[PDB]
Structures are given as structure tokens and as C-alpha cells.
Design a protein around this ligand. Sequence first.
Ligand SMILES: O=S(=O)(O)c1cccc2cccc(Nc3ccccc3)c12
Length: 419
Amino acid sequence: MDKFRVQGPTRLQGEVTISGAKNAALPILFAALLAEEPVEIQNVPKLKDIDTTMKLLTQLGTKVERXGSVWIDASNVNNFSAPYDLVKTMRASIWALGPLVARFGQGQVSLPGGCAIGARPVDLHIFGLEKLGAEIKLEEGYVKASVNGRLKGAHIVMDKVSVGATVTIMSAATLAEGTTIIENAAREPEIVDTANFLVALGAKISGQGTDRITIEGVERLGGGVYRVLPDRIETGTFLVAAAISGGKIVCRNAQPDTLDAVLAKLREAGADIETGEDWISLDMHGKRPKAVTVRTAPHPAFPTDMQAQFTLLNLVAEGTGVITETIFENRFMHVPELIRMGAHAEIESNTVICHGVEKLSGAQVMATDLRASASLVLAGCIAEGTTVVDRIYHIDRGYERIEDKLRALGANIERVKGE
Ligand SMILES: O=S(=O)(O)c1cccc2cccc(Nc3ccccc3)c12
């Protein structure tokens, strides 16, 4: 069980090159099942879920190869069932369903949590596919979809904003007959990237990034080359790393417009920020951050995946600031660990009241959530002494070699094997 041993305090300064977003690469890799011609997906990070996805695609008959790119040939997909052993570690496997039924008229995906009645994430995917004309059967541990001929466009009102179901419905709609209009569509940049990838293959999609997406179906999709957009949360994490350590950083291979709310909140904390077409610079001019108010909400508002990192920023800031979590009004496990490093905070309801302190102290800490865990590593970089962050494989599933990128910024950090 790997751990990171960090020695602080260190001012983090320099540059970092942002990896492609795993959360955009995943939906794009599943959407590639729709492609009749070869596809090259560029800037794909090397992370576990990408490997899991490639193995699942291969089981369906797809030919897949990878390096920085992932090359796909789905011309001969010939098995339309995603089995239990290949889906059990990744809920995103459900994204194979829509493309399979849309292209081949049938598909099925194993459900590890069962088919028992009650409300589940898969419900909105089923809802949308049934609106497009698919018959959905929940039998023998699978969700199975089928349709005679092509799906048919429909006006679909999602009663909850859902990235997963938005992707399923938008992707399947690309091959339906007619027009599909998705209301209350998720607006995430990863949805916009998936939409633009589909358009690159020949789909017709507009409104992506807004609450309403319109897809005009076509008979078949082709192939091409598409580059996955930068990971905005990895970017935010490194910006916060500089913001809490009196540092200065330039993030390369970045996309500023995916972080409007984050950059505005960092400017409130006193950061001097500039942006270019593909870079963001942040400079604290050696100053401690000023406390800020944070309220998470659906994109384009402040992202819940940056909440832990901004909780840490407030805990070393000047002033009392409040973090309100509306998405997972209970994602606060980083708080008790930061208190053990000297932070002052009280969790009340779905909020954390932060009273900033000048300096944290090293401690042995651990969190399962990868953003809370990454926040603990950043805390170790600025705390006095030695910090040991345990179970960092969680971080490894979402960040490529974070210790190397942090070391390039001046951190004293070492990956220790089995302690
Ligand atoms: O949400 S499911 O559609 O079943 C589901 C679908 C596809 C892949 C899954 C992988 C792990 C866990 C699930 N759910 C789960 C939930 C409760 C207990 C055990 C497993 C997965």
C-alpha cells in the first residue's frame, strides 16, 4: 500500500503540464463504439479506468491500441454484452449500452448492484433510452436494451441534471431517426467535449454546454482524430497548490474557460491570475490567501471536485470562510484529518466553517476520496515537518504521477512502498 511522505514547508513554484481529462476520455471512448471508421483519440491520460475501458471495448469486438493516444477500430464490434467481470470495478461501463443499442439494435450491460426496485443512477439512462424507443429488460443481472431498426428522436425532459444520462442519451441520439431535444442536460465541459467528438465523426449536435442539447440523428458515423480537453480539476488542484504556499505557477495545456468560477474564487483569495489560449498563471506574490465563501453547484458554477482543495485554502487563509457543499452535502472527510494537522474548523450541516491559521503541522493522514487525499498531500507540502499520506492509490486513479509534478514545483515528496 503506497504512501506519500512529505516534508514541509515548501513554496510551490514553477510549471505543470495538465493531462487530458479522464472524465472526458471515458465518454468519448464509449462513444467510439459508434464509429465505423478508425478513430485516434489524443491526449488520453494513463489511468486505471482507461485501461478498464479498453479491455471492455476489446471484449465487444473493438480493436484497441494505445501509447499518448488511444486508437480504435470498432468496424467489427461483434459481441454486444458487457459482462460482470469487466464492469465490476467501473460504473462508467454503463455507457456501452446506448451506443450498442443505437448502432446495432441490441446491447446489454451487467449491473453489479442488482436489478432490485428503488431509485438508482441507471434509472435516468433507462428513462432516456426508452424515450428513444428502446425496450429495456432487467433480467439475469443485466440491463438489456433492444429496438427494431433505428431509435427515434424524442423531446426528453430529464428530471435531474445527470452527466451520465446526458452522455447516454446524446450519444445514442446521434444515430436515431429524427431530432432529439434533451432538457435539463448536464453542462459539464466533458459533455461539450463528447459532443464535439461525436460531431467530428459526423453527428449533428448543438446547445452542448447549455441546459438544452439538440441532436439531429444521422444514419452512420465515420472516424477521425480528436484531442481530449485538459483536466480542469487537476488544473484547479495545482492552482490551489500555488495559492496556499505563497507560490507562482503556470499551468500548460490548460483550458481557461472550463474554470471561470474557480479562477474568480482564487482572485477573491488574493491571487494574481492571467490566462492565455492554453495556459493559466497564478502568482501569490508571496502572500497568504484571504478567506473566501464557497458554494458548490452544477457546472458552470463552483465545482464540488474542487471543494476539498478550497477547504484547505480557507484553513490556511487570513479570516473565517464558509464552504457549503450542495452536491454531496457530506463530502468532508478531509476536515478531521486537517484538524489533526492544526486546522480550526467546525462541520455543521452541509457546511464547514473555516477559521484560518498561519501554519499547519505534519501528521499521518488518510482519506479515501481522491480530491480530499490530494488536498492532504498539498497540506503536507505547506505544513511544518513530516506528513505521511496513506492509501494514495486513490490519487493515482485520477492524477498521473502527482508526486513528480509536485516535485517539479519544489515539493519534498517521496512515494514509499508498503511503508
Ligand atoms: O450501480 S450499478 O448499475 O449496479 C453498477 C453498474 C455498472 C457497474 C458497477 C460497478 C460497481 C458497482 C455498481 N453498483 C453497485 C451498487 C450497490 C452495491 C453493489 C454495486 C455498478
